[PDB]
Design a protein around this ligand. Structure first.
Ligand SMILES: [Cl-]
Ligand SMILES: [Mg+2]
Ligand SMILES: [Mg+2]
Lengths: 172, 11
């Protein structure tokens, strides 16, 4: 039953490859449905942002080597924006999956019960985030693409100097 | 430090 979603990535407009995720819909269904729909764009316009609820053309705006890569801010591209398909944010659904390995997909937030559209992919274990961020999926292919994102040189806000853009995205 | 926030990134 678990859905599979993908991003086709470019780095400074140069295709880097495809990342495929499996989403743990059995554990975190509301969280997974949000991400799935942001991949397809099927839910249309975000209520507060008035921009498409869609990861197409969205950046990975924050990268920290040996920690994680973060993206999904479709409205501002810098971490300040984003919103969920439900309007505004939604509650933390489950803390059952641990941040105990690389290549886990988890929600970025701005505190308790503030899940929007922003996510991160771990590149090392991040156990201190347990109870703070909801893990809801995992990379199943394209790990090397994630590593290439992780290796980008970044600015003072940890934003890559070279644009890491989701060219295309969807559900498999 | 090592957080993943959306708006005020901390140490
Ligand atoms: Cl967000
Ligand atoms: Mg469905
Ligand atoms: Mg507003």
């Amino acid at each position: 039953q678990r859905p599979r979603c993908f991003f086709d990535i470019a780095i400074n407009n140069q295709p880097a490859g495809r990342v495929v995720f499996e989403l743990f819909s059995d554990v975190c269904p509301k969280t997974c449905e949000n991400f799935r729909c942001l991949c397809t764009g099927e839910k249309g316009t975000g209520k507060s942002t008035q921009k498409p609820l869609h990861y197409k053309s969205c950046l990975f705006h924050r990268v920290v080597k040996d920690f994680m890569v973060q993206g999904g801010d479709f409205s501002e591209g810098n971490g300040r924006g984003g919103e969920s398909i439900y309007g505004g944010f939604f509650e933390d659904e489950s803390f059952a999956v641990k941040h105990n390995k690389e290549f886990l997909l988890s929600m970025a937030n701005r505190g308790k019960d503030t899940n929007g559209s922003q996510f991160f992919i771990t590149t090392k274990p991040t156990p201190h985030l347990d109870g703070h961020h909801v893990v809801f999926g995992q990379v199943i292919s394209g790990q090397e693409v994630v590593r290439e994102i992780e290796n980008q040189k970044t600015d003072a806000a940890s934003k890559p100097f070279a644009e890491v853009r989701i060219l295309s995205c969807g559900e498999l | 430090x090592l957080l993943v926030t959306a708006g005020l990134v901390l140490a």
